[PDB]
Design an enzyme around this catalytic site. Structure first.
Site, PDB file in Angstrom:
ATOM      1  N   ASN A   1       0.929  -1.141  -0.136  1.00 18.74           N
ATOM      2  CA  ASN A   1       0.024   0.050  -0.070  1.00 18.74           C
ATOM      3  C   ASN A   1       1.041   1.337   0.078  1.00 18.74           C
ATOM      4  O   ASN A   1      -0.030   2.450   0.240  1.00 18.74           O
ATOM      5  CB  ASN A   1      -1.101  -0.073   1.156  1.00 18.74           C
ATOM      6  CG  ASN A   1      -0.629  -0.011   2.485  1.00 18.74           C
ATOM      7  OD1 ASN A   1       0.615   0.297   2.763  1.00 18.74           O
ATOM      8  ND2 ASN A   1      -1.353  -0.345   3.569  1.00 18.74           N
TER       9      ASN A   1
ATOM     10  N   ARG B   1       2.624   9.939  10.985  1.00 16.25           N
ATOM     11  CA  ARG B   1       2.007   9.778  12.268  1.00 16.25           C
ATOM     12  C   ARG B   1       1.375  11.179  12.813  1.00 16.25           C
ATOM     13  O   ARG B   1       2.101  12.125  12.601  1.00 16.25           O
ATOM     14  CB  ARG B   1       3.070   9.235  13.168  1.00 16.25           C
ATOM     15  CG  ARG B   1       3.730   8.132  12.717  1.00 16.25           C
ATOM     16  CD  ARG B   1       3.248   6.433  12.606  1.00 16.25           C
ATOM     17  NE  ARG B   1       2.116   6.336  13.896  1.00 16.25           N
ATOM     18  CZ  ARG B   1       2.675   5.708  14.813  1.00 16.25           C
ATOM     19  NH1 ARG B   1       4.332   5.231  15.089  1.00 16.25           N
ATOM     20  NH2 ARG B   1       1.972   5.401  15.916  1.00 16.25           N
TER      21      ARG B   1
ATOM     22  N   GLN C   1      -6.125   7.771  17.676  1.00 14.29           N
ATOM     23  CA  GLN C   1      -6.577   7.299  16.663  1.00 14.29           C
ATOM     24  C   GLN C   1      -7.264   5.945  17.315  1.00 14.29           C
ATOM     25  O   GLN C   1      -6.540   5.412  17.828  1.00 14.29           O
ATOM     26  CB  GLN C   1      -5.504   7.014  15.630  1.00 14.29           C
ATOM     27  CG  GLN C   1      -6.021   6.821  14.236  1.00 14.29           C
ATOM     28  CD  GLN C   1      -4.925   6.828  13.505  1.00 14.29           C
ATOM     29  OE1 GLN C   1      -4.517   7.991  12.723  1.00 14.29           O
ATOM     30  NE2 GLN C   1      -4.048   5.699  13.355  1.00 14.29           N
TER      31      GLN C   1
ATOM     32  N   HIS D   1      -8.193   7.216   8.867  1.00 13.26           N
ATOM     33  CA  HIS D   1      -6.857   6.599   8.659  1.00 13.26           C
ATOM     34  C   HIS D   1      -7.431   5.461   7.569  1.00 13.26           C
ATOM     35  O   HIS D   1      -7.586   4.394   8.092  1.00 13.26           O
ATOM     36  CB  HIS D   1      -6.441   5.928   9.922  1.00 13.26           C
ATOM     37  CG  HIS D   1      -5.079   5.389   9.586  1.00 13.26           C
ATOM     38  ND1 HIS D   1      -4.600   4.212  10.106  1.00 13.26           N
ATOM     39  CD2 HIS D   1      -3.813   5.677   9.001  1.00 13.26           C
ATOM     40  CE1 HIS D   1      -3.476   3.918   9.737  1.00 13.26           C
ATOM     41  NE2 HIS D   1      -3.156   4.619   8.848  1.00 13.26           N
TER      42      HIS D   1
END
Lengths: 369, 368
Positions: A146, A284, A313, A332
């Site tokens: 990815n 991040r 998160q 995300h």
């Protein structure tokens, strides 16, 4: 064996009955020669929703036909969760960074039968590696599955910030027109100065996609790229981050999160950024002081911030990056496009095929062995 | 001379006090070597809002210091408008395709002093060329001023549509997280087939920007690009549109009924279309159907019919659209250039010196 597989929830409306398209594009290798996953077979159609509890990574039929058990839950947080109850006798754990089942020391102590900790995706940030090592727990990932997904999302977000896309599209969607409103914060990207922090898989893919926008490309990294790559893309090398930032119209981040890079973008260091700089961060959340960035967009210090990583998160409902001005945020999700899932689901079966066969797992997949 | 300049409204919170940034990038030339506009001077700071009524394309001081009059208006529709009423004795008309002052044949005939019909932006879509030719009006455009701008907006749209960015973002804004509701319609662009209809200033800028996304690039046009360009970008040429649509995951329309229910049959199931060319080019209802039914996976653009689009225009709220108002060519960046080229054309025109050939659409009594 028992396979515990932590997945995110199905869509609220339910699990897709149908999809937008029949198939995905065929890709042979990743930039740099690594071939795509190579499982003996797959029991999904590429393009299906594979990373949610009902997609199961296309794994159940193959697991069961072969005498293994698959337990799939999204309930993974803390002591009383399904994850935690099922872990104690699990031989394999699978989870995604998009919905990580943390393998803390405490948890790895308990996983009495744990043999494999598999990331369906990339990294091992949710897994205490040293603990895995002491318990002879193989840790693997689906390397590169990815990195391109994330670089597309980055370039999309850069463009969207630059050209003031999201408010522009709000005006259409809300019935307005308001040209001057759309464009009094709208610029072309062309010949802007764009810097990247780190040019790993992600960064290099981003610079490559940026190039034909005729931007001026800068970067910094622990080590430089082959000068030939530097030449084919006209890179300006900067030895430090803090040397790069001043001359950049747009800064994109690809750092890992460590106490050193934590809150490395703050009210102080933000003085290093050009006025009306754009920042894009899919690395991040915590690399950027949360309240400092909202500040910055409120006073015009920055002209846009976008990214799909957040602290904490899942981001709280009232997380201030949701509604700060000139943001282009998404949850995300960038490495969990249906395209990326198809790759990491194949990778996941591929590791499992080898693991279950006493066959050695690709070198690129292993994190710890 | 009297110069009549039609422009769009200021922002609803007023003409901007400060801007996001302090300047604009240097651009050397345009792809293919055409130079940037060359006025004797400008009186604005590139980056200011120039194409709204208070920006006045930065033409006041200059026109007036030369003894000219400048009327700036947004009022352009009908015979009781400031435009038509001031038109009868105007020597020069300027408007932008983003807020165009139609020079219909009846308007041109009433325009007794009309010498120059100037596009601040590209083309002459809003000017009846026959009448301008018959009436010895010169028509000029600031060629190339926003081709790159549109190209960006195209590839921005293509990404957003393919990656389901807008709804994903709506989830963030609204307090949600909902990973699977974001990605259950999201894909990577990589290795999809992307086709452009025409590869001029915009089409080719697009193709170049798509190349490193590792898409498979298709195009059709009246003519082939040079083979060197075809080869560096691994382009697949198609001789007809009909031939190209069937192989493409994404079709972008860039002009230099007729995309309807019938022609959409040639499109792959789940194709995306991005149209910054002309509103009417894709039938309003064919597109909305196609998205409602899933025959298309996305549509975006900045051009509509009617334009301005009426508040209830279905393209605004239909599934999987990525629309903006008509703005792609009027970024602050593009404006600096076309204000500049508008001033250049004006300077040349006023002094009886010849306008760049490249700017010229009609001159004397013929197409130029």
């Amino acid at each position: 064996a028992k396979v515990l597989c932590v997945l995110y929830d199905d869509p609220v409306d339910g699990y897709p009955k149908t999809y937008a398209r029949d198939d995905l594009p065929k890709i042979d290798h990743y930039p740099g020669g690594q071939t795509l996953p190579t499982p003996k077979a797959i029991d999904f159609t590429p393009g299906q929703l594979l990373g949610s509890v009902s997609g199961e990574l296309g794994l159940r039929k193959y697991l069961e036909s072969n005498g293994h058990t698959l337990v799939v839950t999204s309930d993974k947080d803390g002591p009383d969760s399904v994850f935690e109850r099922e872990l104690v006798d699990a031989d394999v754990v699978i989870s995604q960074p998009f919905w990580p089942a943390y393998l803390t020391p405490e948890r790895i102590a308990k996983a009495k039968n744990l043999k494999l900790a598999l990331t369906a995706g990339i990294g091992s940030d949710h897994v205490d590696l040293q603990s895995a090592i002491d318990r002879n727990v193989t840790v693997a990932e689906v390397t590169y599955c990815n990195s391109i997904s994330v670089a597309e999302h980055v370039v999309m977000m850069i463009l969207s910030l630059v050209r003031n896309y999201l408010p522009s599209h709000e005006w259409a969607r809300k019935g307005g027109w308001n040209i001057a409103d759309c464009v009094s914060h709208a610029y072309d990207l062309e010949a802007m100065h764009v810097g990247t922090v780190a040019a790993g898989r992600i960064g290099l893919a981003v610079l490559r996609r940026l190039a034909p926008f005729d931007v001026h490309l800068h970067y910094t990294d622990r080590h430089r790229l082959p000068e030939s790559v530097e030449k084919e893309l006209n890179l300006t090398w900067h030895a430090t981050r803090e040397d790069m930032y001043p001359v950049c119209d747009v800064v994109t981040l690809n750092c890992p999160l460590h106490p050193e890079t934590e809150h490395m973008i703050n009210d102080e260091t933000l003085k290093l950024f050009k006025r009306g700089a754009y920042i894009v961060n899919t690395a991040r959340g915590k690399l950027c002081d949360r309240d400092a960035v909202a500040r910055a967009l409120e006073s015009g210090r920055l002209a846009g911030y976008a990214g799909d990583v957040w602290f904490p998160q899942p981001a709280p409902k009232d997380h201030p990056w949701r509604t700060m001005p000139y943001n282009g945020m998404t949850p995300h999700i960038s490495g969990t496009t249906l395209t990326a899932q198809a790759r990491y689901a194949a990778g996941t079966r591929e590791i499992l095929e080898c693991f279950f066969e006493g066959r050695p797992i690709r070198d690129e997949y292993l994190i710890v062995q």
